[PDB]
Amino acid sequence: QQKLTSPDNNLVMTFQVDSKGAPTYELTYKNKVVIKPSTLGLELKKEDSKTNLYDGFEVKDTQTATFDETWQPVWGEEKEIRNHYNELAVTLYQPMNDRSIVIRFRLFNDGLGFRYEFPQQKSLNYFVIKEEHSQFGMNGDHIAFWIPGDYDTQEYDYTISRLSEIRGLMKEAITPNSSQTPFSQTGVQTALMMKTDDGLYINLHEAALVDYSCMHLNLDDKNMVFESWLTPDAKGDKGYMQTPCNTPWRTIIVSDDARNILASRITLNLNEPCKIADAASWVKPVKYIGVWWDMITGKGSWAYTDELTSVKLGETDYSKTKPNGKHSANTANVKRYIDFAAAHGFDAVLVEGWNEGWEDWFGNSKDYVFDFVTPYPDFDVKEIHRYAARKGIKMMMHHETSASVRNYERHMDKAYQFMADNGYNSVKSGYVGNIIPRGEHHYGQWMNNHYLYAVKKAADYKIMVNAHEATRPTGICRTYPNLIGNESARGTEYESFGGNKVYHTTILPFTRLVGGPMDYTPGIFETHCNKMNPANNSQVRSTIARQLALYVTMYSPLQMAADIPENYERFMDAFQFIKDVALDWDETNYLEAEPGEYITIARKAKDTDDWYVGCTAGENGHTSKLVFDFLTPGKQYIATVYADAKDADWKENPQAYTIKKGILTNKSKLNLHAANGGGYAISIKEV
Ligand SMILES: O[C@H]1[C@H](O)[C@@H](O)CN2CC[C@H](O)[C@H]12
Ligand SMILES: [Ca+2]
């Protein structure tokens, strides 16, 4: 029986093979069971007994080791991260099949990572995974913060419930989406966040999801045992493997303090070190606005014309079509966004709908849907480039693929060259629609390869990537820091399609943000969409002050101010926080945190002694008693507090805020109240 303990002695991982030769593990935290005894193994696809990789093992060897080194991300929530764990590697031999695997465990002070490894050997070379069976046995009927297991979308509102209640709530939790394949009445996605009755917080996730199929979790509610459930390919199989090869890591992050789930860097720690040698010379954070919300709300169109029932690139002559009067991506309009961006210190402007083919972007399973290089007649690529460069602005490329992946791959070098030739160095991609090649899912091994292929090719071009609808992140950004964003969760766009749950931004940091930043596109000031488009009665579930908080509480090196310029001009005093807030950080201090209820975070701007605070809250609001001793003794600071009015409310009074400017020091105190769906933001600049 094998014992592994964390450096600080608070965590013990016990490993053994049971009487059937099944590898089993368990985990305790400060003498509380976190993981009850749980098995590990896989079942392989038949080319009989060679399909069994789940029992009949015996321990052939074990090796231990300790590691403790620090490293610096190119961008992140702090300057430096410490990677500190005790390790146990267990070689398991299967006499029936004359073959061996290795399970490697790394135990940190804030949780455990394990992976399977398959050494090259006479009897194990090429193999196909039928299913992975990594178990995670819970010690009680925890409260979980979850979205439905789904091979194709993550764009769901979270549900808060007991594990025993998941089955009953799944049907209503799955709302409509143009591409979705739920797999189980008790299937949920990772990262999955839980709170136990005995005072613990537990996050189940994976890290370094590379050359492998995305892991979801299937709950056995007879048992309270969660199990790995991977994403099948077009024929139903779950990964083509070739030794020597590894599974991604599986992680259990645990603490009695919720804030430490946020502080954990286990995910990034388990990724391969940076493989882009000159990354720091060219990867930079980006604050941006865009021609975007117009089409999202329905006020404007991505399409250039309404007269054609369908289009054929290279055949349709758009210069002969009649403009629909609605097309936001036109030169004069883009120049006004360029104007506003330069006036207020933004880095870039995104434009969507610039390229031929948008008339057919949606729902058609169209192969040759875009070419990523040919502009509409009213989009003057060269003039826009000239103007932007004149204002010190960069244009952000848009590559919606409409989920036609072979087509994107065929065009990708030419699309990236086009970007280089015209002064674009960051791209937002998308994958809306069911995947072509048809029969594949968004999160299968096939597509995971494609998203990383796109990022690796971009890096050779010194291009940064932000990919919507891709597989949700698992820390790969350490290895390839030019992956500066994904959506890969329910974003601000759904505030325009009926709204996100009020508590949504109190959960995402605990689940989605684990593994990588999100391009959440915060900053909507006019929260009633009907003012953009009278047919849309959607209302953003936030106050204005809480939108401000999100620049701090939704970590990302890529931050949009998503409203249209007109609306920012109606509230320029509130806008000042968006202009000031930094995007990269030397320090982060998690002040308060409780999933589903509130999160408060102070971050120190990289290479300054300026700090920025944000608070975001759920349906009950939250009262903060803030202490400022992360501030430097003896220094003075100018602090500007942007808070909810005492009458504020997301629904009935979302635009009510106060702005107060005063002096702070590490002796100061502040009582503040985040309203129902509200929050606050503070800039604290050394004098
Ligand atoms: O603007 C984006 C949005 O940010 C993506 O999440 C989904 N989209 C599909 C179409 C268009 O690309 C739109
Ligand atoms: Ca989306």
- Enumerate the domain spans of the chain: 1-269, 270-687
φ, ψ (nearest 5 deg) of residue 33: -65, 130
Which pair of structure tokens corresponds to residue 130? 């039928």
> What DSSP element (H or E) covers 407?
helix 405-421
- Answer whether 274's CB lies under 8 Å from 297's CB: no
Can you identify the CATH homologous superfamily of domain 270-687?
Aldolase class I (3.20.20.70)
- Helices marked H in 424-479 — which ranges? 445-460
Tokens of 89: 């590697």
Tell me, using a 6 A CB cutoff, whether residue 155 lines ligand 1: no
Which residues share a beta bridge with 3? 14
Neighbour count for residue 374 (Cβ, 10 Å): 16
Contact 338, 391 (CB under 8 A): yes
The C-alpha atoms of residue 39 and residue 132 are separated, in whole angstroms, by: 11
Residues less than 5 Å from ion ligand 2, measured at CB: 468
Distance 299 CA to ligand 1 centre (A): 15
Map residue 101 onto helix, strand or coil. Answer: strand
SS3 12: strand
- Residue 379 has which token pair? 């989009």
Are the CB atoms for 141 and 151 separated by under 8 Å? no
- Residue 459 and residue 480 in contact, taking contact as beta carbons nearer than 8 Å: yes
Cβ neighbour number for residue 628 with a 10 Å cutoff: 19
Q: Is 430 in the pocket of ligand 1 (CB under 6 A)?
A: yes
Q: What distance lies between CA 342 and its chain's CA centroid? A: 28
Secondary structure of residue 426 in the 3-state scheme = strand
Strand locations in 352-463, DSSP E?
394-400, 424-430
Q: For ligand 1, is residue 519 a contact (CB within 6 Å)?
A: no
Structure tokens given for 126: 């090429």
Q: How far apart are CA 329 and CA 295, in angstroms?
A: 10
Q: Is 432 in the pocket of ligand 1 (CB under 6 A)?
A: yes
| Residue 356 buriedness (CB in 10 A; 0-12 / 13-18 / 19+) | buried
- Report helix, strand or coil for 246: strand
Q: Which two tokens stand for residue 617?
A: 């809250």
Dist CA 294 CA 300 (whole Å): 5
The coordinates were experimentally obtained by: X-ray
Nearest to 573 by CA among 663, 662, 650, 643: 643
Pocket lining: 288 vs ligand 1, CB cutoff 6 Å: no
> Which residue lies with its CA nearest to atom 5 of ligand 1?
468
Q: Is 318 helix (H, G, I), strand (E, B) or coil?
A: helix
* Residues of each annotated binding site for Ca(2+): 155, 469, 487, 493
Q: Is 568 helix (H, G, I), strand (E, B) or coil?
A: helix
d(CA 425, CA 427): 7
Partner residues linked to 229 by β-bridges: 216
Closest CA to 281 of 517, 482, 76: 482
CB 475 within 8 A of CB 208: yes
- 8 Å CB contact between 654 and 522: no
CA distance 109 to 514: 17
Please give the sequence-ordered ranges of beta strands (E in DSSP) within 32-72, or none if there are none: 32-39, 42-44, 52-53, 58-71
- Scored b (16 or more CB within 10 A) or e, 431-450 reads bbbbbbeeebbbbbbbbbeb
CA-based torsion, 5, 11, 12, 13: positive or negative: negative
Atom of ligand 1 nearest to the CA of 430: 12
- Compute and round to an integer the Cα radius of gyration of the chain: 25
Handedness of CA 53, 57, 60, 62 (dihedral sign): positive
Residue 494 beta carbon below 6 angstroms from any ligand 1 atom: no
Q: Of the ligands numbered here, which is closest to the C-alpha atom of 152?
A: 2
- Exposed, middle or buried, 37 (CB in 10 Å: 0-12/13-18/19+)? middle
Residues 399-415 as b or e (16 or more Cβ within 10 Å = b): bbbbbbbebbeebbeeb
What is the rounded CA–CA span in Å between residue 154 and residue 219?
A: 18
Per DSSP, helices labelled H in 257-404 are 259-263, 266-269, 279-282, 293-297, 331-343, 381-390
CB burial string 258-279: b at 16+ within 10 A, e below: bbbbbbbbbbbbbbeebebeeb
Nearest ligand 1 atom to the CA of 295 is 1
For residues 272, 590, 499, 547, the Cα torsion angle rounded to the nearest 10 degrees is: -110
- Report the candidate in 505, 491, 666, 466 with the shortest Cα–Cα distance to residue 601: 505
The three-state secondary structure class of 343 is helix
Q: Does 526 sit in the ligand 1 pocket, CB within 6 Å?
A: no
Closest CA to 42 of 127, 126, 119, 122: 127
What does the angle CA 548 – CA 505 – CA 210 come to, to the nearest 5 degrees? 115
Catalytic residues: 493
How far apart are the CA of 430 and the centre of ligand 1, in A?
6
Burial of 391 (0-12, 13-18, 19+ CB in 10 A): middle
Residue located nearest, by CA, to atom 1 of ligand 1: 292
d(CA 648, CA 234): 50
CA 549, chain centre distance (Å): 18
Distance CA 272, CA 15 (A): 26
What is the maximum alpha-carbon separation in the chain? 76
Could you give the count of Cα atoms lying within 13 Å of 677 in the half-sphere of its Cβ?
Answer: 21
For 49-198, list the strands marked E by DSSP: 52-53, 58-71, 81-94, 99-108, 111-118, 126-132, 135-137, 143-146, 159-162, 187-188, 192-195
Q: How many CB atoms lie within 10 A of CB 654?
A: 28
Binding-site residue ranges for substrate: 176-178, 398-400, 468-469
> Do 683 and 581 touch, CB atoms closer than 8 A?
yes
What is the amino acid identity at position 491?
G
Chain discontinuities in the chain, listed by preceding residue (C to N exceeding 2.5 Å): 47
Nearest ligand for residue 296 CA:
1
Compute, in angstroms, the gap from residue 163 CA to the centroid of ligand 2: 28
The two beta strands, 32-39 and 23-29, are antiparallel
* Closest-CA residue to 288 (of 590, 597, 521): 521
Task: Round to whole Å and give the CA distance between 638 and 137.
Answer: 50
**How far is Cα 374 from Cα 116, in angstroms, rounded to an integer?**
46
Minimum CA distance residue for ligand 1 atom 6:
468
> Do 263 and 590 meet the contact criterion of CB atoms below 8 Å apart?
yes
Verify cis geometry, omega within 30 degrees of 0, for the bond prior to 517.
Answer: no
Q: Are residues 60 and 91 in contact, defined by beta-carbon separation less than 8 angstroms?
A: yes
Give the distance, in angstroms, between the CA of residue 120 and the centroid of all CA atoms in the same chain. Answer: 34
Residue whose entry in the numeric block shows the structure tokens 């929260």: 527
Give the SS3 label for residue 492: helix
Residue 359 DSSP label:
G
Residue 504 gets which letter from DSSP? G
Q: Tell me if residue 422 falls in helix, strand or coil.
A: coil
Residue to probe by mutation, ligand 1, list 177, 355, 400, 472, most atoms within 8 Å of CB: 400
Ligand 1 atom nearest the C-alpha of 292 is 1
Pocket test for ligand 1, best of 429, 493, 521 (most atoms within 8 A of CB): 493
Instruction: Dig out the tokens for 532 from the structure.
Output: 């953009």
- d(C-alpha 344, C-alpha 393), whole Å: 11
| CA 298/CA 305 separation, integer angstroms | 15
Judged by DSSP in three states, 218 sits in strand
Question: Exposed, middle or buried, 603 (CB in 10 Å: 0-12/13-18/19+)?
Answer: buried
DSSP class of residue 55 equals S
C-alpha to C-alpha distance for 281 and 271, rounded to whole angstroms: 22
Six-digit token pair at 223? 């048992």
Number of H helices, E strands in the chain: 12, 37
Tell me the residue type at 106: R
Q: What percentage of the chain's residues is helix, strand, coil (to nearest 5)? A: 20, 35, 45
- Ligand 1 center to 177 CA (angstroms): 13
307 burial level (CB within 10 Å; 0-12, 13-18, 19+) = exposed
Distance 468 CA to ligand 2 centre (A): 6
For residue 163, the cross-strand partners are none
Angle CA 7–10–11, to nearest 5: 85
User: How far, in Å, are 552, 635, 637 from residue 687 at the CA level?
Assistant: 21, 8, 5
> Tokens in use for 400?
């919606």
Report the CATH architecture of 1-269.
Answer: Distorted Sandwich (2.70)
- Do 581 and 347 meet the contact criterion of CB atoms below 8 Å apart? no
Q: Binding site, residues?
A: 155, 176-178, 398-400, 468-469, 487, 493
Ligand 1 centroid to Cα of residue 492, in Å, is: 11
Question: What's the resolution in A?
Answer: 2.0
